[PDB]
Every structure is written in structure tokens, then in C-alpha cells.
Amino acid sequence: GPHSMRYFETAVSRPGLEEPRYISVGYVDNKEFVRFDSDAENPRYEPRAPWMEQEGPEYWERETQKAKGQEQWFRVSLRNLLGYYNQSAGGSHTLQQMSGCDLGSDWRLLRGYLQFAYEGRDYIALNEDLKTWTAADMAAQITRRKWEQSGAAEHYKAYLEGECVEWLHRYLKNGNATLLRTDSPKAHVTHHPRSKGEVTLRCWALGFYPADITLTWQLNGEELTQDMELVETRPAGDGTFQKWASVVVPLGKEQNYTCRVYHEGLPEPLTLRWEPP
């Protein structure tokens, strides 16, 4: 399937302190693999996936030195934005960044990715061309002009198409056994009767990995639109995920309803119905 690498960076200014809290989180195929946090005893990038333990001390030192540079980049950028928006350092402010690359099943580059947010809102983004910028408002136009003048996009393009791709290739090869592993959902249906001769049927999918999953309900045949209740996919806390899909059915058609579960981990999609105790 497709592959990706992302670094999710956050800097939170701290009233009274010169240095903000800086956090950088790396992901390979939406799974955390590295982390840097400026609030640690001796701040350093640390492995977050078992397959990263094989990286030698020079890798960790090189990444840590980059994070020290980033702390300063974020500190200065937060100070500049405070001026652009006429804000007070008496309050905390948040700067975020997402960057990385996406690859196809053959591992060739599909796209580079670079965006920034200020106070949890889009600020500036690099377009898919990796040459032009989209500023979200008037203040971001100051940054866009500054970056057009310094030719910033060319340096980001070089990283996103080059180093980002080469390192992701290394991570995909090194993390192969972990990255390819799946955990199948275990499904079951529960009965929750209600008013007006109705009963809610809940189809559960538990202990699955990756998080991508589809749950469907049907009365004999044909899928059910909108009337189906669906929770957001949630972590169990052990590396697996959970999800449920429910339907309101008349108190006389329960065994007539079927749920289907679609997940890449399954030998084939699941088919189930409510079972009487």
C-alpha cells in the first residue's frame, strides 16, 4: 500500500520564559517512531519504535542538534508572529508545523508536504508544486513575501523530494517486520432495547491495527445510509484500536440484521448478527 513520513512540530510560548516548550514527533506510516521534547531532563530525540534502536549514536546526535536549531527557529518565529498580530507574551501562543513525504506502493515519491499553523489555525502552506506558498491571512502575507525573497521553497523542495524520501526508504526496510504486522478486529453485536418497540443493535470491532476500518449494517441486503451511529476510532491503549456502529431496529427484526467488518488484517470480511443469550 502507500507509505508516508511526517514530523509534527509544536512550540508553545511560556509567559515569563525566553524559551518555548518545543516538541517534535516523527511518524512512519502514521505510527510514532521518534520524539524530541525540550521539557525532558536532558533533551534528545529518542526511539519510539523498536526498529529505531538499531540507529547508532551519530543518528541521535545529528537529530538532536537539528532539534536545538528548531527550538531557536520556533522561538524567533513565535516572537515575530507576536508582533504581526499585536499580541502579549503575557499569554501563551502556539506554533505548529507538519512536513514530510508520501510514497506509492513501489516507494516512489507521490508528494512533498509542508504546512504551518498559528493558534491552531492555518497560517502558511507550501503548495503541492513545492515552489509557491498559500498565506491564510494578511499577517501570513508578511511571511510569504519574506520566504519568496529568500527562496525558502527551493530548500524545502530539496529536503521533501530528497532526504525525506531516502530516509523513509531506510525506515520502511528497517521497520519491515513491525510495519507489515496487522491485528485483526474481533467483532460482536450487543442489544440495547429502547422506547416505541425499538432496540439498538451495536456492532463492535476491537483490538485491531492499523486504525483504518469499515463497519456496515444491513437488513438482509443493501447498506444503511445516515441512520447508522458511528463513534470515532479510539485507541485501546495497547497499540490497538476500537470502533462501533449502531442501528435502531424494531423489536422483531434483530436476528434479521447483519453487520460487516472490513479491515486489511482479516483473512476475509466479517459477517455477524445479534446472538440471543
Partner: peptide
Amino acid sequence: ASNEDMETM
């Protein structure tokens, strides 16, 4: 491997 940003905002 992470990237170092260019010019500040």
C-alpha cells in the same frame, strides 16, 4: 530524519 527550517517567519 527531520528537517531544519530556513528563514524564520
